[PDB]
Design a protein around this ligand. Sequence first.
Ligand SMILES: C[C@@H]1O[C@@H](O[C@H]2[C@H](O[C@@H]3[C@@H](O)[C@@H](O)[C@@H](O[C@H]4[C@H](O)[C@@H](O)[C@H](O)O[C@@H]4CO)O[C@H]3C)O[C@H](CO)[C@H](O)[C@@H]2OP(=O)(O)OC(CO)CO)[C@H](O)[C@H](O)[C@H]1O
Ligand SMILES: C[C@@H]1O[C@@H](O[C@H]2[C@H](O[C@@H]3[C@@H](O)[C@@H](O)[C@@H](O[C@H]4[C@H](O)[C@@H](O)[C@H](O)O[C@@H]4CO)O[C@H]3C)O[C@H](CO)[C@H](O)[C@@H]2OP(=O)(O)OC(CO)CO)[C@H](O)[C@H](O)[C@H]1O
Ligand SMILES: C[C@@H]1O[C@@H](O[C@H]2[C@H](O[C@@H]3[C@@H](O)[C@@H](O)[C@@H](O[C@H]4[C@H](O)[C@@H](O)[C@H](O)O[C@@H]4CO)O[C@H]3C)O[C@H](CO)[C@H](O)[C@@H]2OP(=O)(O)OC(CO)CO)[C@H](O)[C@H](O)[C@H]1O
Ligand SMILES: C[C@@H]1O[C@@H](O[C@H]2[C@H](O[C@@H]3[C@@H](O)[C@@H](O)[C@@H](O[C@H]4[C@H](O)[C@@H](O)[C@H](O)O[C@@H]4CO)O[C@H]3C)O[C@H](CO)[C@H](O)[C@@H]2OP(=O)(O)OC(CO)CO)[C@H](O)[C@H](O)[C@H]1O
Ligand SMILES: C[C@@H]1O[C@@H](O[C@H]2[C@H](O[C@@H]3[C@@H](O)[C@@H](O)[C@@H](O[C@H]4[C@H](O)[C@@H](O)[C@H](O)O[C@@H]4CO)O[C@H]3C)O[C@H](CO)[C@H](O)[C@@H]2OP(=O)(O)OC(CO)CO)[C@H](O)[C@H](O)[C@H]1O
Ligand SMILES: [Ca+2]
Ligand SMILES: [Ca+2]
Ligand SMILES: [Ca+2]
Ligand SMILES: [Ca+2]
Ligand SMILES: [Ca+2]
Ligand SMILES: [Ca+2]
Ligand SMILES: [Ca+2]
Ligand SMILES: [Ca+2]
Ligand SMILES: [Ca+2]
Ligand SMILES: [Ca+2]
Lengths: 206, 206, 206, 206, 206
Amino acid sequence: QTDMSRKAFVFPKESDTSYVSLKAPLTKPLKAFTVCLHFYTELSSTRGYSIFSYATKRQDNEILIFWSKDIGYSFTVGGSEILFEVPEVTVAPVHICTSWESASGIVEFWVDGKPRVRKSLKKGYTVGAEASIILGQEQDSFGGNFEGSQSLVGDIGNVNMWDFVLSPDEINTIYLGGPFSPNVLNWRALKYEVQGEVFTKPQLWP
Amino acid sequence: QTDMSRKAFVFPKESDTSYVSLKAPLTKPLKAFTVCLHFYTELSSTRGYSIFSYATKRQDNEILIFWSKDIGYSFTVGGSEILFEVPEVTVAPVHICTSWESASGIVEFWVDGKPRVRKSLKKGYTVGAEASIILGQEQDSFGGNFEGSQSLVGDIGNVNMWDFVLSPDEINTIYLGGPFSPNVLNWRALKYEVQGEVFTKPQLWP
Amino acid sequence: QTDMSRKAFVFPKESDTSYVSLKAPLTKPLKAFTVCLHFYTELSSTRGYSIFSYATKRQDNEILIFWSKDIGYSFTVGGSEILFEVPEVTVAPVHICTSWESASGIVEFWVDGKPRVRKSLKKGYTVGAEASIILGQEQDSFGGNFEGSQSLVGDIGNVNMWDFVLSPDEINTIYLGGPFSPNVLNWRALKYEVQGEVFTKPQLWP
Amino acid sequence: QTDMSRKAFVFPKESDTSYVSLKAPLTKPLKAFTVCLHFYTELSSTRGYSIFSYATKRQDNEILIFWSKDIGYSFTVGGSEILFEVPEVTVAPVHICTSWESASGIVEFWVDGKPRVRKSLKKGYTVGAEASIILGQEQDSFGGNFEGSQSLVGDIGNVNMWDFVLSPDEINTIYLGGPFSPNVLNWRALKYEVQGEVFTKPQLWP
Amino acid sequence: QTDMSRKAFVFPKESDTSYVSLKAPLTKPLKAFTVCLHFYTELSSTRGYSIFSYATKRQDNEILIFWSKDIGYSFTVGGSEILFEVPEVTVAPVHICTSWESASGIVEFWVDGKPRVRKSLKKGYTVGAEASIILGQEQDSFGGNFEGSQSLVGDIGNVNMWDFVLSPDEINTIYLGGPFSPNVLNWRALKYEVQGEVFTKPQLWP
Ligand SMILES: C[C@@H]1O[C@@H](O[C@H]2[C@H](O[C@@H]3[C@@H](O)[C@@H](O)[C@@H](O[C@H]4[C@H](O)[C@@H](O)[C@H](O)O[C@@H]4CO)O[C@H]3C)O[C@H](CO)[C@H](O)[C@@H]2OP(=O)(O)OC(CO)CO)[C@H](O)[C@H](O)[C@H]1O
Ligand SMILES: C[C@@H]1O[C@@H](O[C@H]2[C@H](O[C@@H]3[C@@H](O)[C@@H](O)[C@@H](O[C@H]4[C@H](O)[C@@H](O)[C@H](O)O[C@@H]4CO)O[C@H]3C)O[C@H](CO)[C@H](O)[C@@H]2OP(=O)(O)OC(CO)CO)[C@H](O)[C@H](O)[C@H]1O
Ligand SMILES: C[C@@H]1O[C@@H](O[C@H]2[C@H](O[C@@H]3[C@@H](O)[C@@H](O)[C@@H](O[C@H]4[C@H](O)[C@@H](O)[C@H](O)O[C@@H]4CO)O[C@H]3C)O[C@H](CO)[C@H](O)[C@@H]2OP(=O)(O)OC(CO)CO)[C@H](O)[C@H](O)[C@H]1O
Ligand SMILES: C[C@@H]1O[C@@H](O[C@H]2[C@H](O[C@@H]3[C@@H](O)[C@@H](O)[C@@H](O[C@H]4[C@H](O)[C@@H](O)[C@H](O)O[C@@H]4CO)O[C@H]3C)O[C@H](CO)[C@H](O)[C@@H]2OP(=O)(O)OC(CO)CO)[C@H](O)[C@H](O)[C@H]1O
Ligand SMILES: C[C@@H]1O[C@@H](O[C@H]2[C@H](O[C@@H]3[C@@H](O)[C@@H](O)[C@@H](O[C@H]4[C@H](O)[C@@H](O)[C@H](O)O[C@@H]4CO)O[C@H]3C)O[C@H](CO)[C@H](O)[C@@H]2OP(=O)(O)OC(CO)CO)[C@H](O)[C@H](O)[C@H]1O
Ligand SMILES: [Ca+2]
Ligand SMILES: [Ca+2]
Ligand SMILES: [Ca+2]
Ligand SMILES: [Ca+2]
Ligand SMILES: [Ca+2]
Ligand SMILES: [Ca+2]
Ligand SMILES: [Ca+2]
Ligand SMILES: [Ca+2]
Ligand SMILES: [Ca+2]
Ligand SMILES: [Ca+2]
């Protein structure tokens, strides 16, 4: 019931102890999902980092969004990874939405409201329910074994997660800032635990 | 009567077994034609691919639209090919309209509503009626004999065909999204058969 | 009285036998003139071509507009030539308006409604009335001796001619598309003769 | 009482004598602060310079804003420095806002109304009250020991200072030109002393 | 009282005989001045030229505005010169406004309504009243000893002069074609003498 509207988490130092852990209530296994977030960092030209870590007991990298230096975005599900290449790197806040479906196997990536081509990953796969969701590091185990080089220095916010694939119209609505009701992770009724040096401050982006 | 408005075909893998075959009812030979379609792919900098294949018993490549690496668009009628060069490649959905007339031999190409210079090809020629129209591969014979390296990975839609040449005003109307009534292939009353791994999903372009 | 509004001449092949000859009624010698036209061609990066050819018995090149490869526009009157250099070549329809005055010698050139610096050429010279006006090839005699390398492939239209110099306001009016009444060549009351492979088709530019 | 709206200070020559010294009334030690100013100079591609100098008896560089050639902006507090790199240099007036908070240690930088990533500097530190605030040179003692190479030649104005951090909405209001009431330095109620060749003239920027 | 609104002087050839001399009525020495003018030439990439020449018996270069190849604008007063460097060269009409004041020595330069940094030159200096103002060449004596290499080929107009410095608001008004009343040189009440080949034609710029 902690409303984090018009607020963002700030990691101002490079460390291996600062992070935030989010909690989801569901227990039914996931067959399709959508994740949307807003982030701002200046490490693109210096090294790679992690934007969203979702780990289960069996697999550490179950749903992970990564930035790889000189290559671009890396979306990994169930241990298998696809690359979305960006040639030019910009300095400004970035809004990313991602969606994955099981029966079809299609993966959709939206960067700042503009879609990328559709790819394929892990057809006929089930994502576990009991899991740890971490912002700040890229978990090599179940909520532990963090890596300093894979940390994030900057601001993160507007983290929402659904349990079904969103249509383009709803993605445009989210980008513009209309109303919506996520059913996995809600930015207006969020449960979280903060460990280390993490701060909560007004968001820079509009 | 399968209305396909606001929907598109998705090919998410490189294969030689996935395609869609469309059907047309007419039997009178064709002396002039127009084809308009929308597509999105990320293979421009990697290899060439087919966008529209039209095959008859005598000729495999009767009306074919192709992309040639480092060169640009290739329009082939009756086995004779002409080239429309594009030096700059952009990553975004593309709308193409093409028209051919027999008495004059003029060929008209419109990319995103902006026309290209008119060229000449295959004057005094008749295009057969009984034919196979395939999206997904470039048929080297009648339906079949598919080329693995000439497949299309990505999204395709808004395929419309007329049996007469269109004036610039009508092409502008098509680009902006007004009403029209094609008489060979209609995206509101389409007959089609899908083979392989081809999906039907909401369109990404507006 | 053949109204040629919303229409254009198309030369789709490179040849030395296709041209269009226009007729003018006046007989009083010329001491100042203005010529306005629209054209579209993709030969800028390959070779040169002639846009407007005007020839008399004494001089084959009385008023000629040319494009010289890697240099730019070339305006020649009475056999003497001046150059307007453009470093960047664009692919789109081009509207050019030129004007010359005798008592002063100033030559004005307008490309896409934006003027170029004023230059001097052939002061105190009279241009003959009995002449042949040709689009398609540059003339080396009185309506003959065409050169293949100097031909035009593409579209031409909106050819108008006045026997006096126009003010900038009227040039802007012409470019935008207002009304005017030329007194030498009128695109609404044109007399013409077509020889070879020349087609009359709806224009591409607005 | 000396309202300085629509006015600016001009240093037109490079010297080590010209400067302006401003006065602040408060005596309570500072735990957070914000500084906003507008400046215009053409020395970016030649050498460095100081935009805002704030010195105390213990340290000469307590709050100093600097420009370093080929690097960019340098914000130094308590003797510790952090860099904000700009690769592209432009010729136009620049508006800069900076903010520092002690409990968090976060430093915020805004250039032309667009925020930079948040960084960390000097957590748990107190800034003295009795201080000398100088525009024109970068002090190396308490109001003395100026350096010619570090002087500023150009225009400076719209200097305002608060003793608390500002929200992004208030920063946008300041940039647009709305009303506000600073409580340390007020451009409408300034106390100042001008020494050397410094002039007061209408501001160039809107 | 020869109103010259919507008219401009044209020099279409390079020579050392064509020029226009303007007359001013005042006899009180000058302590501050402002000069505004519009010009169009294509010689920037070829050589230098003079835009405004102001000469007296003692000094030939009293108020001279010049263009130096590969460097940019050169403003010279009383024989001492300062440079305003432009790295990029454009092809379009240019509007320049320059201002000088004696008590402070500040020199102000406005190109196309955008200010440049303020610089210092000739503090405590008086400009003579009895003088020759020439457009067309850069006088090396009292209205004589012209130089061909330093001539201007192109168009000039909207020449106005004030005997006091102008605030930025009035400069913006001038750039937008508002009303004003100069008291040294008035483009609506000009006294001029034309010698050589100089023409009066409608202005190209709006
Ligand atoms: C434990 C293991 O972690 C993942 O591997 C990640 C790898 O990082 C290594 C650690 O995982 C850890 O094993 C060790 O590496 C040792 C390794 O354990 C040992 O067997 C071998 O002999 O020596 C290695 C030392 O180099 O320390 C680091 C190097 O990094 C690679 C990078 O490709 C993997 O991809 C994993 O990195 P990641 O967690 O950050 O995720 C990737 C980042 O892009 C995905 O994009 C494994 O994947 C398993 O989860 C687990 O078994
Ligand atoms: C004269 C032209 O010949 C063909 O040109 C195509 C050729 O592709 C080869 C064809 O031979 C194709 O049938 C296939 O043949 C295989 C196939 O298994 C079967 O025929 C035989 O048993 O084994 C053959 C082993 O190769 O092999 C391919 C490589 O090559 C040209 C260019 O070199 C074109 O690629 C043609 O194929 P395309 O469909 O892609 O043509 C497009 C036209 O623009 C490409 O732009 C044609 O098939 C016709 O026979 C004839 O026109
Ligand atoms: C008309 C006469 O010559 C013009 O020169 C043009 C020349 O074209 C050739 C002409 O000379 C033409 O008579 C013929 O040549 C004759 C001639 O007897 C002789 O050359 C030889 O015997 O062969 C022919 C038969 O006897 O062939 C043509 C090709 O080409 C030059 C090349 O620069 C000129 O440029 C003229 O051609 P152009 O129209 O294309 O000029 C363009 C202007 O930009 C080129 O850019 C000249 O105009 C003479 O002044 C004129 O008297
Ligand atoms: C306390 C000392 O001074 C500041 O650091 C500046 C230093 O530059 C020197 C200045 O300190 C200045 O007084 C003088 O130095 C004296 C001093 O006695 C001693 O350092 C030297 O041996 O003799 C000099 C004459 O007595 O000369 C300058 C060079 O070190 C750096 C080097 O550039 C900077 O100059 C420091 O500050 P700055 O104002 O000069 O330049 C800015 C600093 O960021 C530009 O970024 C600080 O107080 C430090 O505590 C310490 O260095
Ligand atoms: C007297 C001199 O006049 C102007 O000088 C410009 C100079 O032009 C030369 C003149 O100096 C003129 O006397 C003569 O030069 C003499 C002189 O003895 C010497 O140059 C040479 O050895 O012998 C010549 C004949 O005996 O010839 C002309 C060309 O040239 C310089 C260098 O370019 C500048 O151009 C001088 O000023 P400017 O009018 O050309 O404008 C320049 C544009 O930037 C200045 O910025 C000037 O009025 C001098 O002040 C004055 O002393
Ligand atoms: Ca991991
Ligand atoms: Ca790891
Ligand atoms: Ca084929
Ligand atoms: Ca093939
Ligand atoms: Ca000729
Ligand atoms: Ca010729
Ligand atoms: Ca110091
Ligand atoms: Ca110093
Ligand atoms: Ca001189
Ligand atoms: Ca000279």
